[PDB]
CSV table of C-alpha atoms (C1' of nucleotides) and ligand atoms in Angstrom, one decimal:
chain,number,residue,atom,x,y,z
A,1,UNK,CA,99.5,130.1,-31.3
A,2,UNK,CA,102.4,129.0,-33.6
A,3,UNK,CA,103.2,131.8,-36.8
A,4,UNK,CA,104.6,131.9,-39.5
A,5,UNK,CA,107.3,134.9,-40.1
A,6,UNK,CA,109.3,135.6,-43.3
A,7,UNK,CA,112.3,138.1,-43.2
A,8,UNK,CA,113.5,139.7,-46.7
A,9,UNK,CA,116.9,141.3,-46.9
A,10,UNK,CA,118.4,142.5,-50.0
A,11,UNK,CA,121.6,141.5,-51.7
A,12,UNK,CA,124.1,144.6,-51.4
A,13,UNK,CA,121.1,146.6,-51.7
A,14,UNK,CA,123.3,149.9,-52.5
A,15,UNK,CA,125.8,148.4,-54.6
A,16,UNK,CA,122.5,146.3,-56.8
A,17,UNK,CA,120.6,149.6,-57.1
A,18,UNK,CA,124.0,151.3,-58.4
A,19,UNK,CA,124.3,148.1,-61.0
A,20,UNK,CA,120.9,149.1,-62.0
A,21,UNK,CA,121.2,152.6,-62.5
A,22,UNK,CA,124.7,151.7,-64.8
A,23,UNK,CA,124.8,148.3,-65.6
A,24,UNK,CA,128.7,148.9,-67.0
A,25,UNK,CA,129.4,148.2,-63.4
A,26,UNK,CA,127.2,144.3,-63.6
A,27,UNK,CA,130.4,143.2,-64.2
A,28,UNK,CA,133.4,144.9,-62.2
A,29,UNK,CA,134.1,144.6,-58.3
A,30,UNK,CA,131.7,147.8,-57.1
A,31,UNK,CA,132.0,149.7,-54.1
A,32,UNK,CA,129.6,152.3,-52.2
A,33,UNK,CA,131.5,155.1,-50.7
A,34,UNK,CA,130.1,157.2,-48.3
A,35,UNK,CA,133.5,159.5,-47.0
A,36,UNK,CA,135.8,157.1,-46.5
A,37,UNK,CA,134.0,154.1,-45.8
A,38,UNK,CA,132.9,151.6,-48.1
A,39,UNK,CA,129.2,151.3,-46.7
A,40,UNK,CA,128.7,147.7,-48.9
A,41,UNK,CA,130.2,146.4,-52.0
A,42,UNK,CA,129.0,143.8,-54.6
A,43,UNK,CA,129.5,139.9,-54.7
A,44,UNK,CA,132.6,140.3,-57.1
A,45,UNK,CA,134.0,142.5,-54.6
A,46,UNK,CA,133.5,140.5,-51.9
A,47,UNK,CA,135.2,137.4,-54.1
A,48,UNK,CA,138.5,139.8,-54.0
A,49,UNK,CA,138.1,140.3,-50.5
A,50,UNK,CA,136.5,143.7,-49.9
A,51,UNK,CA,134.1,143.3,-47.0
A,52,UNK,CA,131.4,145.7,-45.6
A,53,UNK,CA,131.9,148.8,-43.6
A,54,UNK,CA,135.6,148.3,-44.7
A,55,UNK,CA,137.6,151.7,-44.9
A,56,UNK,CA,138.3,153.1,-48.4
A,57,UNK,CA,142.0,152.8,-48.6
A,58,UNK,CA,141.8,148.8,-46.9
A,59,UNK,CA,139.2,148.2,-49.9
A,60,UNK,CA,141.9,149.7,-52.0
A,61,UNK,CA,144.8,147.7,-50.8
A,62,UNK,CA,142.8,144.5,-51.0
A,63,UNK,CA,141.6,145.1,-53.9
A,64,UNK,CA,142.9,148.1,-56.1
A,65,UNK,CA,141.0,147.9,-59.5
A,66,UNK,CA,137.7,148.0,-57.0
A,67,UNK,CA,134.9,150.5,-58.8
A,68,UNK,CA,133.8,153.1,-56.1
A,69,UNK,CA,131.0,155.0,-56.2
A,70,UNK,CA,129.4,157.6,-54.0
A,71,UNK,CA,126.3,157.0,-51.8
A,72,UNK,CA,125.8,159.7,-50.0
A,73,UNK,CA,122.8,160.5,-51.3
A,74,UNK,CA,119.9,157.8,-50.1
A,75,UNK,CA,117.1,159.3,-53.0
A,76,UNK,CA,117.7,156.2,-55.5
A,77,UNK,CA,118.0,153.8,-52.1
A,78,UNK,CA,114.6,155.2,-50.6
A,79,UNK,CA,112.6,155.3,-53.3
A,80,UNK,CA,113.7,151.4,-53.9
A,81,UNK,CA,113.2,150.5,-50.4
A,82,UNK,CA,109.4,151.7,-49.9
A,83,UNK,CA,109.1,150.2,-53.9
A,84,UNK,CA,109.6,146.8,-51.8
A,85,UNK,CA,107.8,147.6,-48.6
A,86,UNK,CA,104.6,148.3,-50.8
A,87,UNK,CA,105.0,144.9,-53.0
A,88,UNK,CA,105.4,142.9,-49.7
A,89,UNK,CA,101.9,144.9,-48.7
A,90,UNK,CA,100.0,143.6,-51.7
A,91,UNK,CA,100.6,139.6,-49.8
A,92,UNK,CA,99.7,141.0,-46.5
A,93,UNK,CA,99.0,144.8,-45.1
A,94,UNK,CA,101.0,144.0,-42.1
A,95,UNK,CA,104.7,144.5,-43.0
A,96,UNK,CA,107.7,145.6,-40.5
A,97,UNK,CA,110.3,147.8,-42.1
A,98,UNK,CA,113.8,147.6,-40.7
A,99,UNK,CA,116.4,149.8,-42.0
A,100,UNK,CA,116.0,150.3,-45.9
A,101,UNK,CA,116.1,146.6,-47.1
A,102,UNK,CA,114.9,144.7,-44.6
A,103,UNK,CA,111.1,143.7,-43.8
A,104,UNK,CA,109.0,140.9,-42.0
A,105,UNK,CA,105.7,140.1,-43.2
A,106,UNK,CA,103.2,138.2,-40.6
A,107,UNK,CA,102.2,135.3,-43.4
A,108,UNK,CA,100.0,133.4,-40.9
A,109,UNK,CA,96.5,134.4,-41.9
A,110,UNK,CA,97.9,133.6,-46.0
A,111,UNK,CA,99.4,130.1,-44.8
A,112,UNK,CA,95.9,129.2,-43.0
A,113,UNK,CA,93.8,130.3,-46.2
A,114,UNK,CA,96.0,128.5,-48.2
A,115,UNK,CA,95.9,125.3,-46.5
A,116,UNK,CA,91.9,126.0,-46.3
A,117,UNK,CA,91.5,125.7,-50.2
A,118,UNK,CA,93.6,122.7,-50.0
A,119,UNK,CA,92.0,119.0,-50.0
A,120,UNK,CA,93.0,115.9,-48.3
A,121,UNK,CA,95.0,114.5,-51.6
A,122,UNK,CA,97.4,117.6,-52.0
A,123,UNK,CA,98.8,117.9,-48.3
A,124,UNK,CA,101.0,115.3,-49.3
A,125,UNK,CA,101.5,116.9,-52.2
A,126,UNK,CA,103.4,120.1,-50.5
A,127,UNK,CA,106.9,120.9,-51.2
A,128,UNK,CA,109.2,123.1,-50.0
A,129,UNK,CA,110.6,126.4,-52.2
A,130,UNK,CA,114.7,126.6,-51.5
A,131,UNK,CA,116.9,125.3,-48.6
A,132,UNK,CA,115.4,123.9,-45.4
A,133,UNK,CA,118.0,124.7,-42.6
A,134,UNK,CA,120.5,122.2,-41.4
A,135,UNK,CA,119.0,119.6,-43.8
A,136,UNK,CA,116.4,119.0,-41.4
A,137,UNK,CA,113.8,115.9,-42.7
A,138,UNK,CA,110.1,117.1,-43.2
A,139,UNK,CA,107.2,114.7,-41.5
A,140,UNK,CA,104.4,116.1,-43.9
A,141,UNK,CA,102.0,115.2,-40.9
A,142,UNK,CA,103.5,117.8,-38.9
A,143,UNK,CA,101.0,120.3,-39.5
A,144,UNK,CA,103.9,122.8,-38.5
A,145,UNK,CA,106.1,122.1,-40.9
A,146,UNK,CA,102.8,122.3,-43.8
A,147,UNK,CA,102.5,125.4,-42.5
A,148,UNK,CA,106.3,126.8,-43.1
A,149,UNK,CA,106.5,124.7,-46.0
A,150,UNK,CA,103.4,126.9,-47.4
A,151,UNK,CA,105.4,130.0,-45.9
A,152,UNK,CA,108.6,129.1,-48.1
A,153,UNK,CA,106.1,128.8,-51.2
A,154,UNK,CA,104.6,132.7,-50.3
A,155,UNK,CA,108.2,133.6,-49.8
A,156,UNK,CA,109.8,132.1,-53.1
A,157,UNK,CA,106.6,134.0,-54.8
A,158,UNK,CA,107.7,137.2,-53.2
A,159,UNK,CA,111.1,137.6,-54.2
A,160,UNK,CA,109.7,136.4,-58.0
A,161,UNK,CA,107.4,139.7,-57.9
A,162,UNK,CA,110.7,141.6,-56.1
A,163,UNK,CA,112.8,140.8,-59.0
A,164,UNK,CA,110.1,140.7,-61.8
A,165,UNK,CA,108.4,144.3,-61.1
A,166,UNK,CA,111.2,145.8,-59.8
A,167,UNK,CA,114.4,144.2,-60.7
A,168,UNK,CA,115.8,143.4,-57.3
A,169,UNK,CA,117.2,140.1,-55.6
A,170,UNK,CA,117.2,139.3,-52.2
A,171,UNK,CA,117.3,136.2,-49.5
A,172,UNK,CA,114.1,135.4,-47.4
A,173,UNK,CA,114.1,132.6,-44.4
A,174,UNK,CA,110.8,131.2,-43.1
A,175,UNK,CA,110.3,130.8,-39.5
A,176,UNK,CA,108.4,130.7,-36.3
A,177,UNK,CA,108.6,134.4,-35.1
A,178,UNK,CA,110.8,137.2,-36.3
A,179,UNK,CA,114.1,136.5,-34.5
A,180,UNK,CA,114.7,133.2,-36.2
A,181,UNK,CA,112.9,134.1,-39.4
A,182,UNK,CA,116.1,137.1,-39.6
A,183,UNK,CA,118.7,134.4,-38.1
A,184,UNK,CA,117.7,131.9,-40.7
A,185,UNK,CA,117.5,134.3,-43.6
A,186,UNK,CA,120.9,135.1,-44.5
A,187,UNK,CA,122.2,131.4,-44.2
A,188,UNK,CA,122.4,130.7,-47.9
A,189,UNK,CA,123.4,134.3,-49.8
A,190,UNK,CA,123.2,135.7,-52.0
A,191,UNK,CA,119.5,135.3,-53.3
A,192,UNK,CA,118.2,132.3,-52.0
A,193,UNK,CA,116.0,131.2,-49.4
A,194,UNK,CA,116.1,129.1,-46.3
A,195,UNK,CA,113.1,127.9,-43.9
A,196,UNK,CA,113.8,126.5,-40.5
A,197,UNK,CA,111.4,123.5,-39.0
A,198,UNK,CA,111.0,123.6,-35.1
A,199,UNK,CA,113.4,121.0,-34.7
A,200,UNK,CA,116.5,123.0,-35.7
A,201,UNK,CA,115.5,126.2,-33.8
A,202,UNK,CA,118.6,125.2,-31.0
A,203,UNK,CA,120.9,124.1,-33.9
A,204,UNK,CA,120.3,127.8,-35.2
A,205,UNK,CA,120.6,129.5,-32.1
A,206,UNK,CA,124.0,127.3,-30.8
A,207,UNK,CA,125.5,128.3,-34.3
A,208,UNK,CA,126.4,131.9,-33.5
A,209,UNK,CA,129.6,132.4,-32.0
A,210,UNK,CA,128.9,135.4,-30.0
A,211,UNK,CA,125.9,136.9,-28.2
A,212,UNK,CA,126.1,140.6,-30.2
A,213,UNK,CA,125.0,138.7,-33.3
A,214,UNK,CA,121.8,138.0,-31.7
A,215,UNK,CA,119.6,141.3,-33.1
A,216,UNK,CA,118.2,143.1,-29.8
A,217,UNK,CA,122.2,142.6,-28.4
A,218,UNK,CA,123.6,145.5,-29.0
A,219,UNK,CA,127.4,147.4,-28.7
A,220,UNK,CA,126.8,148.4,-25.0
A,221,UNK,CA,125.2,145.4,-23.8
A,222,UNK,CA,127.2,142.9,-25.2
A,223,UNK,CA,130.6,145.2,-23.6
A,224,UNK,CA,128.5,144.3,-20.1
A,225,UNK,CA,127.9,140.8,-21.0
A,226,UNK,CA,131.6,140.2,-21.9
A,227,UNK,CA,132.5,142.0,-18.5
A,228,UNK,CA,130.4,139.5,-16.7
A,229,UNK,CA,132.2,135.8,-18.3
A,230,UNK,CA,129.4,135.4,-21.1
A,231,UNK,CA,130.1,135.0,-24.4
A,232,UNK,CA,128.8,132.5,-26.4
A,233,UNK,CA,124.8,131.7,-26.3
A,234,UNK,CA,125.0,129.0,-24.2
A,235,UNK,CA,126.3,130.9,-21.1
A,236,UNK,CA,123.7,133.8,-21.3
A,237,UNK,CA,121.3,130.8,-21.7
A,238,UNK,CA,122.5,129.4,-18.5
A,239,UNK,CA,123.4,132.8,-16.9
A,240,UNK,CA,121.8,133.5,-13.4
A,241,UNK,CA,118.6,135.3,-14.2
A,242,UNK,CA,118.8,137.7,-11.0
A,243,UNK,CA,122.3,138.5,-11.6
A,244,UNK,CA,121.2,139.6,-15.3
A,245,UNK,CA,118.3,141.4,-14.3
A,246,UNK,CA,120.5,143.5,-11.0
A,247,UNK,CA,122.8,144.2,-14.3
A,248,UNK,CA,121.3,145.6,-17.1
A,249,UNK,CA,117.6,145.7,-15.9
A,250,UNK,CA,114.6,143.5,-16.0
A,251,UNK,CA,113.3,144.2,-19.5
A,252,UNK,CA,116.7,143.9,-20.9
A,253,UNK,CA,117.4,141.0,-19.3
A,254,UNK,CA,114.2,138.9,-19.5
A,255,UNK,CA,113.9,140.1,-23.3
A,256,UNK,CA,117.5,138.9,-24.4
A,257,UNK,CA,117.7,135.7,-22.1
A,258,UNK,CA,114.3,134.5,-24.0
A,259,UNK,CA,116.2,135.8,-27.4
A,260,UNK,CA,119.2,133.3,-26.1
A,261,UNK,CA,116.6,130.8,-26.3
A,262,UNK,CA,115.1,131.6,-29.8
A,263,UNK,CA,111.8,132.7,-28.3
A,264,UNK,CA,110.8,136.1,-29.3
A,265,UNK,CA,106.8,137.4,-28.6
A,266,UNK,CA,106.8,140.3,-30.4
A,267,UNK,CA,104.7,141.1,-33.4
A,268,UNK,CA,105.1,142.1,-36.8
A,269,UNK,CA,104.3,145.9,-36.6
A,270,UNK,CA,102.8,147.5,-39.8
A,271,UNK,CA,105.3,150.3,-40.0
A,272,UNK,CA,103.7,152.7,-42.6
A,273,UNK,CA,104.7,155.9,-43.5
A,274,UNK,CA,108.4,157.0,-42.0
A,275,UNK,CA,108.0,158.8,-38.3
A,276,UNK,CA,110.8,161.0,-39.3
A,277,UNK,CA,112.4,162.7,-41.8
A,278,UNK,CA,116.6,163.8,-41.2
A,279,UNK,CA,119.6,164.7,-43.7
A,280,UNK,CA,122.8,164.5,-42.4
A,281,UNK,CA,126.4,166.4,-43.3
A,282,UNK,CA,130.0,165.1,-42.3
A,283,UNK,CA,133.0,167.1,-42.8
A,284,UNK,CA,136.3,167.4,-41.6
A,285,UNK,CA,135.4,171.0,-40.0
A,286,UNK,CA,133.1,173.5,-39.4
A,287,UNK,CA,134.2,176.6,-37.6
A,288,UNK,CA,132.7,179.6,-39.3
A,289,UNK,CA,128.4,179.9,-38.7
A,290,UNK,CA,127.8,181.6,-41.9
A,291,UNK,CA,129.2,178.4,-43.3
A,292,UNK,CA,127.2,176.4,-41.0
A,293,UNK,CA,124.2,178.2,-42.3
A,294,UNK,CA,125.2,177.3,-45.7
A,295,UNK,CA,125.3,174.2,-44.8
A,296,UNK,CA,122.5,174.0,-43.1
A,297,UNK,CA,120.6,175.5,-45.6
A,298,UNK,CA,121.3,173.0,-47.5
A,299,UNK,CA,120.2,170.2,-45.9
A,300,UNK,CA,116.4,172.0,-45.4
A,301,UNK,CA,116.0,172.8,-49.0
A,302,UNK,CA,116.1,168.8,-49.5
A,303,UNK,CA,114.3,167.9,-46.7
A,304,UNK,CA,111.3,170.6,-47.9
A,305,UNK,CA,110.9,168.6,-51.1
A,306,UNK,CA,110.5,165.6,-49.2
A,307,UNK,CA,108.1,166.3,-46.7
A,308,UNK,CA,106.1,168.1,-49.6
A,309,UNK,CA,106.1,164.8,-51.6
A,310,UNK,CA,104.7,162.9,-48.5
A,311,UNK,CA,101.7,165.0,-48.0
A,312,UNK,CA,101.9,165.4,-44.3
A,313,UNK,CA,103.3,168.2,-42.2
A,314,UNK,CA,105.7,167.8,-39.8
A,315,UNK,CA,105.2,169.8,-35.9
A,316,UNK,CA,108.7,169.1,-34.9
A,317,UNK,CA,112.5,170.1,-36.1
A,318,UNK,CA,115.2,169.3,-34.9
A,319,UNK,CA,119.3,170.3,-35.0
A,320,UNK,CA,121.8,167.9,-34.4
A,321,UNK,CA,125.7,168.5,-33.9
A,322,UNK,CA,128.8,166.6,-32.7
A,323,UNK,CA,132.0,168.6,-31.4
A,324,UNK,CA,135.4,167.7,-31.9
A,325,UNK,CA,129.0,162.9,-28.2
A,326,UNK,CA,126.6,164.2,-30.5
A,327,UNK,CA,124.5,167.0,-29.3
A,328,UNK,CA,120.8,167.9,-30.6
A,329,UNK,CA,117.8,171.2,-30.2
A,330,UNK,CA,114.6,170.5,-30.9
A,331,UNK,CA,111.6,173.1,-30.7
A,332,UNK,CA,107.9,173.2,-32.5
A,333,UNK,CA,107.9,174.6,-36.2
A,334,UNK,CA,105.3,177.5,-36.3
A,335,UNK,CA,101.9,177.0,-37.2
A,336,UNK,CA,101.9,179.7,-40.1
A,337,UNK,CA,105.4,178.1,-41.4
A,338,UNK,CA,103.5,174.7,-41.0
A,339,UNK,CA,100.3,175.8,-43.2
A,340,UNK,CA,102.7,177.7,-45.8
A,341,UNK,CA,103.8,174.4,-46.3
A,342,UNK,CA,106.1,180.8,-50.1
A,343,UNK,CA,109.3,181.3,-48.8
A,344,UNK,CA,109.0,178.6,-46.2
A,345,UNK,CA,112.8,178.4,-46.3
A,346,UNK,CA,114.1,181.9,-44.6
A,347,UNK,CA,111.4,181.6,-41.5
A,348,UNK,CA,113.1,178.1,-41.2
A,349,UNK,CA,116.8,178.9,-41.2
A,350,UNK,CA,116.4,181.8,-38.6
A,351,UNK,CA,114.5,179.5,-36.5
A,352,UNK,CA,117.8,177.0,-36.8
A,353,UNK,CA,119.9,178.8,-36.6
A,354,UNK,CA,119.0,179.9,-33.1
A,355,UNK,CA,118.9,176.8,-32.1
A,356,UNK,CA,122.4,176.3,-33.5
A,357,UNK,CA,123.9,179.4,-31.3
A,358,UNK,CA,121.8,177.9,-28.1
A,359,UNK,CA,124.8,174.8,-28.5
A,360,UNK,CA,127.9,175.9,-30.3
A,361,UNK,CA,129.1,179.1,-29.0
A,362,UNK,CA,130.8,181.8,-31.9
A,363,UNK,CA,132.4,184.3,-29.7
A,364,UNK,CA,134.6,180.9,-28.9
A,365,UNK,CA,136.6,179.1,-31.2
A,366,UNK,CA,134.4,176.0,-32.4
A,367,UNK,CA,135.1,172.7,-34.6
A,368,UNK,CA,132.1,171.0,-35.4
A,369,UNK,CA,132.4,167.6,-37.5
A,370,UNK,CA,128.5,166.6,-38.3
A,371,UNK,CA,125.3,169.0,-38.7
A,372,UNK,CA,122.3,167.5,-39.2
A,373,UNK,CA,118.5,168.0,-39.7
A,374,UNK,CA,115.4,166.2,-38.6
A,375,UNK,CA,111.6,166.8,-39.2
A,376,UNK,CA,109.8,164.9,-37.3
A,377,UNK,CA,105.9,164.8,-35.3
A,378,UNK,CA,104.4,164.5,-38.8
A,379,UNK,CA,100.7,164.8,-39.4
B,1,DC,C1',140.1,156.7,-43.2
B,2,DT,C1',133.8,156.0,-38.6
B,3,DG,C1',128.0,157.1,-43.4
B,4,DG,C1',123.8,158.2,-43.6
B,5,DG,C1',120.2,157.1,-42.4
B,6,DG,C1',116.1,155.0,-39.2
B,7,DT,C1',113.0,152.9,-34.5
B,8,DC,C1',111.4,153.2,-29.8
B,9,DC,C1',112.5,154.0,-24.7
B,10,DT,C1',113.9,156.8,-20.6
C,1,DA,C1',117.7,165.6,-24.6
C,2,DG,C1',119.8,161.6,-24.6
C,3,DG,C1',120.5,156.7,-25.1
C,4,DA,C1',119.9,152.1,-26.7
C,5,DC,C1',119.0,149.5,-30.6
C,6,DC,C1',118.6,148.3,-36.1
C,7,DC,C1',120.4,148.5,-41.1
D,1,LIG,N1,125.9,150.4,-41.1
D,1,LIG,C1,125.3,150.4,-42.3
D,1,LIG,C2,124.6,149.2,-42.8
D,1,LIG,C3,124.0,149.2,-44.0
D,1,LIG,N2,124.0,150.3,-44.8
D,1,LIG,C4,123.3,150.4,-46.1
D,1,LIG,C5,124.2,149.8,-47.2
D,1,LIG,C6,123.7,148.4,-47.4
D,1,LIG,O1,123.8,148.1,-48.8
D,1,LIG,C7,122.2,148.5,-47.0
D,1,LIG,C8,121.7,147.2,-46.4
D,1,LIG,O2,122.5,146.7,-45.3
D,1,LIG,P1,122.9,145.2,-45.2
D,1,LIG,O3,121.9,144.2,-45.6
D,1,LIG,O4,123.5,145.1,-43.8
D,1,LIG,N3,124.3,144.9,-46.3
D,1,LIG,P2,123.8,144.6,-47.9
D,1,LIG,O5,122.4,144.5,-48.2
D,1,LIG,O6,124.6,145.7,-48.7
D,1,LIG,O7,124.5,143.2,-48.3
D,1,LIG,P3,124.0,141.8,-47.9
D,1,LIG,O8,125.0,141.1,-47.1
D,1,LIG,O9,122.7,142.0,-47.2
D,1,LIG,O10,123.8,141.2,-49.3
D,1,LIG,O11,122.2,149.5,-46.0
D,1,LIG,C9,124.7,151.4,-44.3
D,1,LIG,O12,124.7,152.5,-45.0
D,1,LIG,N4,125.3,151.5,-43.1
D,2,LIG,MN1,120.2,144.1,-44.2
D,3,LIG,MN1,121.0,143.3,-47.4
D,4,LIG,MN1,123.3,142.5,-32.3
DNA sequence: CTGGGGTCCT
DNA sequence: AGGACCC
């Protein structure tokens, strides 16, 4: 029943493409600025004290010679991020994508054929590749700990192939399903690798100091927790389960009480080509629609490439908003629009734009801070 | 001085 | 259509 999970995250993913692209910047403290926020910075940076999701003019003040540059176009971040999804499928087909630079890969089956080839002389023979969390002795009769030990070997080989064919560093942690294989992941950063043995799976979990930096725990319910006297792990651990449930639900609460616990069911999901395909625009204000078609227009002319280069169609779009609380239309695209897939673009913007004047009323005064477009149903 | 994306559930 | 969650 037992599996063995890695989980890859990338060091300052946006920042390390950026030193890529212009390597002049390897060197200096290097933002990403997306408006006025700092999205992620580089190690240098972070030595000076810049820290992610940090405001542009805090980054600044802490540190003023800091290199900024802008990110608010995700083309050179996508392309990289499926670049890595598709490596990580050449180990094994089955690979979860979260966000851009972040995936699992199932490595059971690998482990298992691995061991298979092996004889009796060489189990005692198997090492692990980087840092086994909390120190944590290995009994090489544990056929458990083989088995992550293997896992750390398939994972030290991974991020060799990430930064030989494609340049990029990143952390990995080894464990026994995908909570802990994330938990354990980023302990030793940047670009290194930790892999956590049964035996430390409480040590791991008790080491947080709050219950939102469990993944699944989120702004809301972690507000609730805190309204109901739990914060650290150990008290939802210990938390009346009926109480929990009457609170926030029984899915909710059975699924995050196991998560207090370090047990998590759920499988790696192969998670393919993207569901959905959105641009976004922020601005201080929006009042006049002729703008907001420009705008809009914009956005769609991007998004059209895209969904070209992917080679389905999507059977959805959608029109987001948010006022001076964000606000969306959806409706079906046409089928003739979706088979031109020509000017493809003018049927489009009408279309939008009705769906803009069904929210935002013109004949009022209106201050809109964020338009944004989605295609999604593909096919 | 709070981006620009994504997933699935309800 | 919105809401919760992830990065
Ligand atoms: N809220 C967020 C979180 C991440 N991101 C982008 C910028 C990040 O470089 C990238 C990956 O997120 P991340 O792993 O949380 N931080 P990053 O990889 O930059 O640094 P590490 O701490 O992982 O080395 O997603 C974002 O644009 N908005
Ligand atoms: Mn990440
Ligand atoms: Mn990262
Ligand atoms: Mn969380």
């Amino acid at each position: 029943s037992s599996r063995v999970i890695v989980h890859v995250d990338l060091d300052c993913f946006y920042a390390q493409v950026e030193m890529i692209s212009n390597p002049e910047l390897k060197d200096k403290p290097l933002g990403v600025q997306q408006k006025y926020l700092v999205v992620t910075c580089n190690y240098e940076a972070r030595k000076l004290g810049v820290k992610k999701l940090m405001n542009v003019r805090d980054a600044k003040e802490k540190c003023p010679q800091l290199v900024l540059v802008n990110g608010e176009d995700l083309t050179r971040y996508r392309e990289m991020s499926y670049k890595v999804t598709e490596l990580l499928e050449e180990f094994s087909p089955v690979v979860e994508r979260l966000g851009f630079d972040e995936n699992f890969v199932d490595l059971t089956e690998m482990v298992e054929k691995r061991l298979q080839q092996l004889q009796s002389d060489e189990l005692s023979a198997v090492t692990v590749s980087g840092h086994v969390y909390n120190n944590q002795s290995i009994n090489l009769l544990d056929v458990l700990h083989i088995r992550l030990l293997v896992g750390s070997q398939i994972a030290a080989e991974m991020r060799e192939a990430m930064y030989n064919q494609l340049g990029l560093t990143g952390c990995a942690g080894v464990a026994s399903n995908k909570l802990l294989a994330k938990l354990v992941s980023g302990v030793f950063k940047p670009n290194q690798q930790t892999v956590l043995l049964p035996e430390s799976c409480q040590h791991l979990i008790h080491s947080l100091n709050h219950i939102k930096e469990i993944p699944g725990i989120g702004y809301k319910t972690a507000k609730c927790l805190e309204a109901l006297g739990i914060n650290s792990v150990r008290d939802l651990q210990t938390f009346s389960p009926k109480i929990l449930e009457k609170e926030l639900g029984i899915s909710v609460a059975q699924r995050i009480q196991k998560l207090s616990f370090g047990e998590d069911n759920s499988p790696v999901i192969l998670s393919g080509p993207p569901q959905s395909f959105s641009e976004e625009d922020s601005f201080k204000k929006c009042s006049s629609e002729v703008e907001a078609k420009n705008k809009i227009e914009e956005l769609l002319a991007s998004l059209l490439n895209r969904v070209c280069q992917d080679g389905r169609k999507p059977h959805t779009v959608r029109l987001i908003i948010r006022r001076y609380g964000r606000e969306s239309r959806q409706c079906p695209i046409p089928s003739h629009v979706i088979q031109k897939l020509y000017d493809v673009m003018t049927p489009m913007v009408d279309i939008l734009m009705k769906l803009f004047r069904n929210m935002v009323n013109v004949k009022m005064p209106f201050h809109l801070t964020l338009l944004s477009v989605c295609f999604c149903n593909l096919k």
